Each structure stands twice: as C-alpha cells, then as structure tokens.
C-alpha cells in the first residue's frame, strides 16, 4: 500500500554511535566504523552508518547532555553538524561530504533528529525556508521533550509548520541521508504519542524526493497506534533504551509476542540498537562505562537469536574497530542471518516456565526454530513438532553451529544453561 | 496458518443474534422462526450462525436488564442449563441438543453466549465439576466478577479444578451440537480489564472437545494490547461497547476500524458487533430505545452495512428477521457487496479528513474496492484520486449497492453525499 | 499558630487583584485609581490590599492571553522587573517602590504576582544570579515548565544558587515594600502537580527577606494529600482552578469549601479565589467572557459573598472598582457580615440535601451565623433546626444582609429562597437577655 | 459539633485480637486479654477489648479467610457469633454475656464488622427486620470487597437500606457493644471510599441510643474526604495493614505528617495496631508466623513514641498474656502517656536526612519533644529550643527513662542508632 515500505524490504542493518560514544561521536570515528563495516559487514546485509543524537552540539561529550546550550544551526532554523567534530561540514556543506564518502564505500547514511524545531530559533525567532513566518510562529506553547532541552514541538496547526519539517528533509536529502532516527516521538512521561509530527514527517520524507527511511524512538511504542506505526514508519521502537543488562533482555521476549503481528515488509517493531562488543566509550547510561559488553556469549547469542527470529532491525551499537573475533562471529553467520531476511510467520510457539520457543519460516519450506531458556536453571527445553505443524519427522540443523544434527522423530529438545538458547532449521528428511 | 482453529472461520461468521430483539429473554419459537427465515432467504448468501444469547438459562428473563442474584438452571456439575419454560425440546435433561440438530438439519449452525466463569449458586453451595474431586468453591476466584451481571464468579486458573470447570463446558457443548460461542464478560471490564488467563483456558478447553466450535469474544473495546492474544485465541472479538442504532456509536465505530485493521485476517475477525436493522427492542431497552424499527435512517444503514463490510467484520443480524421489509433483505443480499466481505482483503482508510473518510480494498481479480463515506453534518464532495488509491490509469467504476456502471474515471472519484451517507465503488481495468 | 508567618494575616486577606479586569495587562494608573478608590471607600471595611497581578514584567502584554516566547523586562540578576511603559515610575531601576511607597501612604498594602522560576531567557542567556558566581542555566530544572505561560523554568532546589536566586528575588521585593505575593503555577499542574520543593523554597526566602510577605498560592485546584504543606507554609492557596462568573463554577465551590474547611485557620487561608464582581473583562478575555458588567445576579453574587464570607475565603475584589454602582459596593461595606468573616469560626457544613445547603460558624460571644442556600434550579424553603446548629434554646434571629431583626425562633429557621439565592442569619441568646 | 466527639475525647486505647488470632480468637481468648488488661493496664487507660473480624465464621483458622463459606446469621439478615468459638452466644444470646464479663471488669466491648449486607442473606432472600423488605432488595449488584468474600455492599438509595443498617446497631447495642471497627469502607483497590455506606452507619449509631465509637478500616484513607471522616468518625486508618516490619514504620512518619492537622478531641486518625508482644499465633500476615514482634526495642520505642506524641489510638495486637516485663513497660508508663492524653498540637519541627523531630506540648506549658533517627546510622539528632518555639531555657527530662537531663540553654542534641528514637518534657526552668 505505501510506497516507502519499498524503502525497506527487510529490516534495517547498520550501525549507530549511541551505545559507544552516547552524543559526542566524531568524523572519525564514524568514518572508522563505516570502513570497518564496509571490509567486513557489508556482503552481510549491513549498511547503514548512523549518527546520533546532537551532532549539532559542539560541547557533547557524554550520554548526558548539556542542557539549553547553544547549538549550531543555519540560517533557516535547520540544526547543522557541528565543524568541531565534523570538520567536512565546514563552509556550510553539512553531512554532504562525509555521506558521499559513506556512499562511496557502497554503504547508507543515517542521522538522528530530535522532533520539533530549537528552542533557540524560537527565542530568536529565526526564518523558517519558503515562507515568511519564523520560527516562533509555529512553535507548540507546550511540548517539550522530558529527558532533552533543545527543541519545542512544532504545531502542525500553524501556517509553517509543514514547511519547517519539509525544508529539513529537503537539507537532509541534499545531503544524501538515507535513513532519519526520530525521537521524542513515539512515548512521552507527559504527552504520549506525537501523532501529528510522525505525519508531517512523513509527509516532508515524501516530498523530499529521495529515499529516507523512517526510524522512530524512544519506546515503549503503544499498540494503540499500531496503525498509525504500521503505516507511516519503518521502524518504530518497541521498548525505552535497551542496554547489556539481562533484565531487559529477558523483557524483550513479551513485547515481541505483543508486536509479533504488526511485523512485516517496510513496517518494523524494534527492538533496539545491539549493545555488543565496545561500548560506554564516552556513554554513561545502562549502569555503565567504558567496557566490553557485560552480556555473557550465552546471552549475546540468545539477544541475536531473538532479534533475527523477530525480524527487528540490526543496528550494532559497539564501535566496530574493536571487535573481537566471536564478536564478528555475530554479525557473519548467513544461515542464521537467512532467517532475519527470509523469514516470515514468527511467532512464539508457547512461553512456560521461563522457557520459550519462536518460530518462522521461509518460502521454501524450511522451518526456523528458536528455543529459549530465560530461566534460572539448567534444563531441557523442548517442543513437539506437532506444536510447530510438522506432522513428519525433518532433518535438523544447529544454525550458530553450521552443524548438521541429524533426524527428528517426535521433538526438539535440548540441554540449555540458563540464558541460553539455540536456533533451529528444519527440512524435511531422508 | 499457525492456528488449526482458524480453518473453522476463513471468511467472517455471517448469522443472527437474538439480544438486540430479545435481550435475555428470547424463546425456543423465536429462534426457529429466526432460523426458518434464514434457511428460506438468506442461507445462500452465507448467513449461516443462529445465535441464542445471553441468559438462556435464567427462566425469568423478560429484557436487556437482568434480574440479579436470581436461581440458575444448573445440571449436576455446575453447568449451566436451558430453561424449560422457554425452550421446551430441554425438557428431560437434553439442553440444546434437539434446538441444535433442528438448526442443523436447515443446514445451519448453532451458536450460544456464555458468561465467564462458573456460576454463583454453584460456588455458594459448591457444587461438584465433572471429572475431578474439588468442588466449585475451590475453583473461583475471590476477587472477580462481571460488573454489569450477577450470574458467576470468574474462574482461578491457578486452581487445580479450573481447566476442568471449562473443558466440560465445551464437553457439553460439542454433546449438544454448538458450532459458535459468544463469551462475555472477558475482553473488557470496568474493573479488571482483559481476562486474559480465561481465554486462554477456554481456547484449550474448546481445541480439547474435538469439535469445531467458533469462538467470539465480548463485549469491547479491546485493547490493543491484547492483539497477539485476540489473534492467536479468538475467531472474532469486540472491537467496542455494544452498538446500537445511534449515529454516534457508528460514527464512533470508523476509528476502531482504522486501529484495528492491521489484524484483521482468515480465521481471526475484530468484530464491529451486531447490525441492529429492522425490528429490533422488542424485549429489550438498551440503546435508549424501545420496541422499534431501526432509528437508523437508510443513508446510515447503509454506511454501516458499506464499513463493516469493507473491513471484512463478522456480520450478525440483531433484529428480528421475519418482520424484515424488501429494503431490510436488500441490504443482506447483493451479491456485488458480499464479494467485497467475502473475497476482499487488504482493507486500509485511505484517508479521514473533515468528516470525510475513504476506505479501499481488493480482490485477487483485479478489482479494488472504495467506499467513500460523508460522516459529517452537511452535504459534501467527497472525492479521491486514484493515484491515492493506486491505479495508475483509468479504471471503469461501478456502484455496488445500486448495482450501477458508472462509466470510465480518467483521475479521481467525486460523489456528492448528504451527511452520514456513503458510497461503494468497484473499480475496474478498462476495455 | 506555631509559625511566625501566621501572624501576617490573623484575618482573611482582603484586597483589589488586577486579574478579571485587566488581565496581565494593567497599568500604574489603573493601579492608582482602584488603590485611591479602595483608600475611600473601603478601607474602613478590612480592604487593604491593592494586588498587580501577572506579567507585569511583559511591556506588550493586553489580555489574559499571553503573548508567547516574547522579552521580558529584566535586571542584571536574572529578575524581572516592571515594565516601564506600563509602570511610568519604574523609570532608573526603581521597580515597584514609588508604586508601593504611594500605596502604603494611602494606608494600605502592595502585592504582586509572580511566576514560579526563572526565566527562560535568563537561562538561554546564562545571566547571573545576584550573590553567587554560578548562573541562571546552572540552576534551571530540565524538565519544568508552566504548561499555560512560557516566561519561566523551573528552579531545580537540589542546584548550587537556587535558593540564593529565590532569597534575591524577595530582597528585591522587600526593597519595593511589597507585602503579599501570589505565586502562581506552583500548586496544580497538568504535567506535574504539585511544587512542593520551590514552595518550600519561597516559605524561607521570604523568611530571609526581613519584611512581613503574605504567601498567597495559585492555580488550583489545590489537592488536600499537600494540606499539612500549604497549612505550615502557605497563607492563602487556592482550592480551585480559575473562578469566574458563571454558576457553575459558583455551584462547585460548595464542595470545595466542604472539603478543606477543617484546614482554615488564623494564618492559613484555604481560598475560593477573586470575586467576579462589577465591571470584568475590560482587557480579559477569559470566562468566556469579554467587556461586562458581571453575569452572576444579585441572588448569584450575594450567594458568592455570603460562602466566601462565611467560609472565611480571602477576598480579591476583581473588578475595576471606579466602575461600581451603589449595589456593587454595598456588597463591600456591610459590617455586620463582615464580622463573621473576621471573628467567626469553626464554619462548617451542617448539611447538603437536594441542592439545599447550610453552613454555620459562631463568634466568640456566642452569636452563632447560620448560612442557607437553595443551590437548585426551583423556589423552595430551605430549613435547618436549631437542634442541628446546637443551639437548645430559642434565640433571636437577624437578616445580616438586609439589617433587619427577625425576631424570636423556637425551633427552626425556614425562609423561601430562589434558585441560586441565599440568606445570612446572626442567632443570639432570648433568655436572660431583655425585650 | 457532633456529639459523638464526646465517646471518644482521648484516642482509644485496648486490644484487638488481630495481629495474634487473624479471623479465629475464641470466647477464652478475648476472656484472658481482657482479665489481663483489667488488672495490669486499666489504670493506665487501655480499655477496650476489640474481637476482630470474622467472629461469625465458625471455622476459621488464620488471617487468610475461608471464601465463600456459610456464615452464622440471624433470621434478619445479621450476622452472629459462632457459637462453636464463642459457647456463652449459645441459645441467641449473641455477645451479650460476653459484653457484661467485660463491662463487669470496668472494660469496654468491641467489635469488628465488614461493611454491607452478606451474600448469602441476598442470595436467599432472607428479611430485613422492621420492614417488608428483603435482603435482595437492598444490595448493590457491583459493590464487594476485593479481599473478603463474606458481603455485598448495601445501596443507600434503597427502600430498607437504612433499616438494615439501624437493625445491625440495635443488634450491637443491645449486646452492649461501645466501639465497631467497620472494614472495608475507606480504601478499596477496586472502588474507593464508600461514602454512602459511612453516612448510613453514623445514622445508625445515633439512632441506636447507645455510645458507639466508630473506627474505620482499613487505609489509605484519602485525605481528599477528610472532612467526611473528620465528621463521621472516631478513627480511621491512615495506612494499609501495619505489621512488625520497620519499612512500614518508617513510612508511617509522612502519613502522620499529612495528617496532622485532622487530629483532635473525638476524631483521631490511626496509625493502626501495634504489633508488639507475641504475635501470629493463628495469623500469616505481615510476612511472619508464630513470633515475639520483629521489631527491635529501639523500633518498639520509635513507634510507641510516634503514635503517642501524633495521638493515634492505641490497640495493642499482641497476646497480652505472654507479655514480658519489657512489653509491659512501654504500655505502663504515666508519664509518656500524659503525651498521648493531654498533648495536644502535634507537628512535625523537621524531617532531613532521615532525621525527624515533632513536637507538642500540653495546657500546663511543657513541651513535649520527639526526636528520631530513622537512617540506616548512628547520627547525632538535634534540633533548637528556637524553632521549637521556646524563648528562654528549659528543664529537659527522658520521659520514657524517668531522668532529669538538666537545664538546656540553646538545644537539644542526642546520639541516636539507627532507628532509634527519643521522648523528652521541656518544662520552665526555676
């Protein structure tokens, strides 16, 4: 039905600079991920590079931001990179070069944006592009955003406001940006959803003329706009910001089950960015610093395992450089990563005793099987081929292992250590 | 595909109900009467479900109001039981079964309303459950109750006994020959919101009876919260409070529509309730009304029979069928607008914009469907183009309901419609 | 009383407040007039107060619409400061002292009305805070704001300079000589309900100051979980959002003296807010009204008068005073009812049945006052035996209003009363007393 | 105002079997209580002997309720005392024999009752005295208790509604009832405060000729209907159910603050029983079982010393019988209890790093003072003759020690442990 689900046809892969340099990444260092995924990721579906929040804030230098400072900013109330940190933006030309040059490594860019207009244009009442009101005409009285104090919600009632988010995405496709994370959009402490800017953002990406695919954040996303997500965003996140702490993980698998049905070609639930290898570089947030990430392998495996069953985009939040070899172990397996971009149907087959079993398939008949233990204790998990619609025995194979396992006749069912999983396919036999 | 039940309900249960007419209180004549007329007039459009309602085992019952804290009929096992007075073919302990092999042998499909739970009498005095040792008391939850009727207690899952309790239900049930229940009191609640852990049994309890029986859930709103729970468990759940024939309720009734449309699929039917057409209120008094035709004007009638089925909503009739006039059946049986229920898919609001909404669909011919609603207060143009609805060259059109060609349509639909009216249009390749 | 603070309003404030008449709009000379008015006629009566309210700070301010995002006049310590145009004798830094000075030489008392926080500007800007090094931004709350005004943030308790900006604001408006300040956005909130830390804040700054401040707390509705706080630190706070001439809200306030009349008390004064009296609505466009006389009747207004009064509300005249007629002042200048504003207590509600309502208080030489009200929409006796007022033997009754004697009463008192209209009886002892 | 004020002029002070026995005290139990408080605790003031709730359940057994089971119930709708616990109600007789044993050892009687009409009365149908009414015909058809399943809420509004409720207190009068504790009617999960029900019972109290004084179970009571209970009641609970857990304790300290200012002669809200002593007999609740309080005795003198200087009532919940010496002490000392009888103005001076110190002071100018450490450390606590309002030097004495401390010139200072508090009389000095 709508034509920016083309943009998307499988979920989102890439990276982002949040979980390792929170709101303060560099050229550079972006530059050093986007070469390292275009070395080693790419021939694996991942391609998006993507800067996050507050490249327009000179000072960043943490996870915490430095509240109501000065940001840098065109002439046209349009934040724009700050040349400290960016210095290919200098003269004017904002994310243009660095963005061509991730192209030219046959890779996308991304950036975040936060939802409104600055505060600061307001207070100056700075121009908006293609109309004479300023910016002070358009501004919402009250909308702010609870945990950031630089912008203030755009009202959409106002003669402008549609002009303002048009003529950022007019500067964001001049620069060649292919992918926009939004924030401040979805879940809200004091105003809930902001319904009426995802559709003037919409509306703006469809004007622009290029490509930009549409990422909204933070979570918890309500179901009670599932219609509204379904239909105007590409991704849309399911959970406030996921870290490397098993209790959030272990809270993934409900929200899965709650979103499993709206999941499906350019309309993505998310699970957030994967908090593996290096992170807390210059971040502060999930109870951390400066570290490895604090997931056990059985727990990296077990996030992967449900990621690519779901279906959610893939945005690895570690800087890259520093991956070590089981790290990018991750990211290189083809038959687990078939199931993310082939796969359909996922659902979870049952949930009991903190043991839990997804499954999906492929249009060639063969059956992905995700079988979780989120208990505490050691135990075998098991399901019934019955129970995923089998009614023959089928081959199976260890799909992390590359190993075959062999003949099936009634069940699957493994020893698994608490926090662990395994991924299944099965075909049929003989 | 995942779920066996939803081979029971590929397109959505098309029937008759007898609350909207009855209430409470509708009778074993009543239902056959009912039923005759749709053998007769309606059975090979699909209508097929023949619904008894809510409190058939309260032989009292005289309305939509129920009378509280009243006896039960009840077997031996806590079970809840027809009222003789009122279906005299019970009498001798045989329940539904001979109303059922009646329905049936019109070559219909026999459905009944429970209410959540087990019921009150059978807790106080606590009665046994077939097939265990632990009486109704030890089964009830202490902290659950309908808000709106004082027929049950809400049942424990976490009690030995519970699971049981249901699996006899629908034990008897299959025994009498039901191919559909309506449960309430389980979706919505005032006081305790969704009972999540009841639907859930009650899915096991039916998948154990060996028999197909369709299940739909009531009364709303649901929340979207519970979707994958609706999808997975239920053949159809209420999307709303129960609807009436006031203009608000189906104003109302677009948005639920539009939150709800993304689940709607074979075997799984978010429901917009019953049509409250014709002679309805008969002995009931809900919806501000009393004995009466439908306050809804044919405009409006026609609105709501051109949404629900667009948006694919199980369609059960709530008046009472033998008062039905031409214009009554009419709106039940052309062909052009079922195929649109029956074979369309993909329903999706184009848009809604000042009090003008547009819907479209599509069949796998190569036809698209739009339905073009005025649900304002003044006479308007209400138009669409068909690059927003996807065709990229003109398209023949014809009006459905008047069964019209329209001729060819080069750039956009635009029909002048009088408040609350609509329209639905085929479009078509062009010769 | 076991704060000091109490004893800077033993009676309910009674006063003038801009609000309903001008909006956040008014001028010095419009200040002057209603003062020199109040000094005249009223003064005699307990009206003391002459109340500029907000955005006196706000030089193109004329409605009680706000002008959003827009320059605030403003010191060199991130404090607000009169509007020049406006406030002529602001004029060189002088602020509201001539103002006060002149108000105070009419024998009578100066307040202001203030936002909670900083302002916005101040924080952008990074202006100093008077007494310390660090500056606005540094003690700016993130995520504090006034959900209907865009002048301020909120002011963060737990920051280094905080309260040292509040202390420097009630130096500045100890300096003017003011003596009441209403706060507002401080008590309900949309977003965040209660400030329950910058009240705190405000209760020891003004402590510091040096100079006797009324705390009058605003908007409402003011939630009862917060009673033992705005009892201990408030004077005045309001229990309801925006009052206004219409019986619907009058209607209302019934229950919200019900709710919090065992929280009045010398010093701490739970408030039905201004009354909507005379000629409103001159530069206000709010109540769903514009330029007017009020819309309450007479039966309405003295049904406003007669709870507030009984209840021991403050009382905010809100109309432009030189504009009453001779019925608008007499509501003003009646002694007898006012004593049983100023020297009654224990009011309470003795019942509410059917929209009628009675309430009742009594003085210290055992008059007892006995409020009735038909607060239905038809004609009808409202009663009340002595019995119920604890009073077990017959008593002399007097109209406090009308100023007429009633005569004896054995068992009850009964009147006919209109919709909407009410009646305010003084009990006195028959026996031992002579004819 | 309202003459019922003068039952209860000082807070109540007695037992209730609650905290000991749950739902299941017998005849003997309440017989033994009351002989013990008779001869070592009426001098002091304790006087009421409250049997708590469920006396009409013939097989209870702990504080977890047996649902939905017969009750003992007279021909009128109104439950009776199970005969089996209670041998002297043989023969109709209710708790009239009962009531004279304690009148005849200089003590009060009271009772616990759940608020409404029983479920099995309105199931049957069965009368309702005075009337031609039946029990059916006055229940509301949505109004239980989320926690008990014994009743259902009676509608005011009701022909009968009043005479079913005047009919229970011409029942407890006659029994020579002077104190009920009513549950379910001021906190509900499920429905709030129920007004109605609150004015029909004070109706009926009035008119059953007999001093009755009224206490309301259980909390939160909302301060929103203050004034309702101020006017209708005697007490009422602040809190949910208190038991020997120091969380609990330390949060009473902020539900004495916000109620405060409702405190005075006749209406007294209540901090609750006080789990001293032997405890959890025939009770499972508050985490424990069979058990001396878990309180230490510096947490037994916190919370003596808070509900004393606030003026809750004082219901003592554990078996009197197994008292030691030292829970005896804390309920026989005259002179801290002249602080709970004739203090009067009670507030909180400060509260700041979990330190708290309140005041109040009696007719005769001394000022009582209690100081409390209720941090995890040892800390001194003080606080100045200045803020509590005293203008020359003053006499200080332990009033729980019975020591004179000497003269103070500018504060009072005490090294407190954690948890630990302490209660001093400032008086004149020469």
Same mark, same amino acid.
């Given at each position: 039905?709508?034509?920016?689900?083309?943009?998307?046809?499988?979920? &989102?892969?890439?990276?982002?600079?949040?979980?390792?340099?929170?709101?303060?990444?560099?050229?550079?260092?972006?530059?050093?991920?986007?070469?390292?995924?275009?070395?080693?990721?790419?021939?694996?579906?991942?391609?998006?590079?993507?800067?996050?929040?507050?490249?327009?804030?000179?000072?960043?230098?943490?996870? #915490?931001?430095?509240?109501?400072?000065?940001?840098?900013?065109?002439?046209?109330?349009?934040?724009? &990179?700050?040349?400290?940190?960016?210095?290919?933006?200098?003269?004017?030309?904002?994310?243009?070069?660095?963005?061509?040059? #991730?192209?030219?490594?046959?890779?996308?860019?991304?950036?975040?944006?936060?939802?409104?207009?600055?505060?600061?244009?307001?207070?100056?009442?700075?121009? @908006?592009?293609?109309?004479?009101?300023?910016?002070?005409?358009?501004?919402?009285?009250?909308?702010?955003?609870?945990?950031?104090?630089?912008?203030?919600?755009?009202?959409?009632?106002?003669?402008?406001?549609?002009?303002?988010?048009?003529?950022?995405?007019?500067?964001?496709?001049?620069?060649?940006?292919?992918?926009?994370?939004?924030?401040?959009?979805?879940?809200?402490?004091?105003?809930?959803?902001?319904?009426?800017? @995802?559709?003037?953002?919409?509306?703006? #990406?469809?004007?622009?003329?290029?490509?930009?695919?549409?990422?909204?954040?933070?979570?918890?996303?309500?179901?009670?706009?599932?219609?509204?997500?379904?239909?105007?965003?590409?991704?849309?996140?399911?959970?406030?910001?996921?870290?490397?702490?098993?209790?959030?993980?272990?809270?993934?698998?409900?929200?899965?089950?709650?979103?499993?049905?709206?999941?499906?070609?350019?309309?993505?639930?998310?699970?957030?960015?994967?908090?593996?290898?290096?992170?807390?570089?210059?971040?502060?947030?999930?109870?951390?610093?400066?570290?490895?990430?604090?997931?056990?392998?059985?727990?990296?495996?077990?996030?992967?395992?449900?990621?690519? @069953?779901?279906?959610?985009?893939?945005?690895?939040?570690?800087?890259?450089?520093?991956?070590?070899?089981?790290?990018?172990?991750?990211?290189?397996?083809?038959?687990?990563?078939?199931?993310?971009?082939?796969?359909?149907?996922?659902?979870?087959?049952?949930?009991?005793?903190?043991?839990?079993?997804?499954?999906?398939?492929?249009?060639?008949?063969?059956?992905?099987?995700?079988?979780?233990?989120?208990?505490?204790?050691?135990?075998?998990?098991?399901?019934?081929?019955?129970?995923?619609?089998?009614?023959?025995?089928?081959?199976?194979?260890?799909?992390?292992?590359?190993?075959?396992?062999?003949?099936?006749?009634?069940?699957?069912?493994?020893?698994?250590?608490?926090?662990?999983? @395994?991924?299944?396919?099965?075909?049929?036999?003989?």
């Amino acid at each position: 039905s709508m034509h920016h689900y083309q943009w998307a046809k499988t979920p &989102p892969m890439g990276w982002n600079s949040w979980d390792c340099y929170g709101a303060s990444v560099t050229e550079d260092e972006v530059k050093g991920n986007a070469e390292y995924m275009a070395k080693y990721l790419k021939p694996f579906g991942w391609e998006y590079v993507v800067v996050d929040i507050q490249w327009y804030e000179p000072g960043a230098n943490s996870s #915490i931001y430095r509240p109501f400072v000065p940001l840098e900013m065109d002439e046209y109330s349009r934040l724009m &990179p700050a040349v400290n940190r960016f210095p290919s933006a200098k003269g004017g030309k904002g994310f243009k070069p660095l963005a061509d040059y #991730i192209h030219n490594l046959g890779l996308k860019f991304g950036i975040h944006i936060m939802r409104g207009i600055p505060r600061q244009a307001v207070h100056q009442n700075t121009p @908006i592009l293609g109309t004479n009101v300023g910016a002070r005409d358009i501004a919402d009285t009250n909308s702010i955003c609870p945990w950031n104090t630089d912008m203030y919600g755009v009202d959409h009632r106002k003669e402008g406001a549609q002009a303002y988010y048009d003529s950022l995405f007019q500067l964001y496709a001049q620069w060649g940006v292919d992918f926009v994370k939004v924030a401040d959009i979805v879940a809200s402490k004091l105003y809930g959803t902001h319904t009426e800017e @995802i559709k003037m953002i919409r509306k703006a #990406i469809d004007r622009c003329g290029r490509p930009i695919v549409l990422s909204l954040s933070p979570g918890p996303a309500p179901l009670d706009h599932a219609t509204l997500f379904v239909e105007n965003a590409n991704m849309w996140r399911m959970t406030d910001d996921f870290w490397d702490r098993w209790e959030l993980l272990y809270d993934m698998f409900e929200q899965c089950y709650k979103w499993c049905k709206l999941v499906g070609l350019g309309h993505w639930p998310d699970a957030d960015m994967l908090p593996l290898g290096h992170i807390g570089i210059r971040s502060v947030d999930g109870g951390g610093t400066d570290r490895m990430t604090r997931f056990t392998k059985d727990e990296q495996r077990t996030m992967m395992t449900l990621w690519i @069953i779901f279906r959610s985009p893939l945005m690895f939040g570690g800087e890259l450089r520093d991956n070590d070899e089981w790290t990018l172990s991750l990211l290189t397996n083809e038959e687990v990563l078939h199931v993310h971009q082939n796969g359909y149907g996922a659902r979870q087959v049952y949930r009991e005793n903190d043991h839990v079993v997804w499954t999906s398939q492929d249009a060639e008949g063969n059956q992905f099987v995700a079988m979780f233990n989120i208990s505490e204790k050691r135990s075998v998990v098991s399901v019934s081929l019955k129970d995923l619609g089998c009614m023959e025995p089928m081959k199976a194979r260890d799909l992390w292992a590359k190993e075959d396992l062999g003949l099936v006749k009634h069940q699957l069912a493994f020893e698994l250590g608490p926090h662990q999983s @395994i991924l299944v396919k099965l075909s049929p036999a003989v």
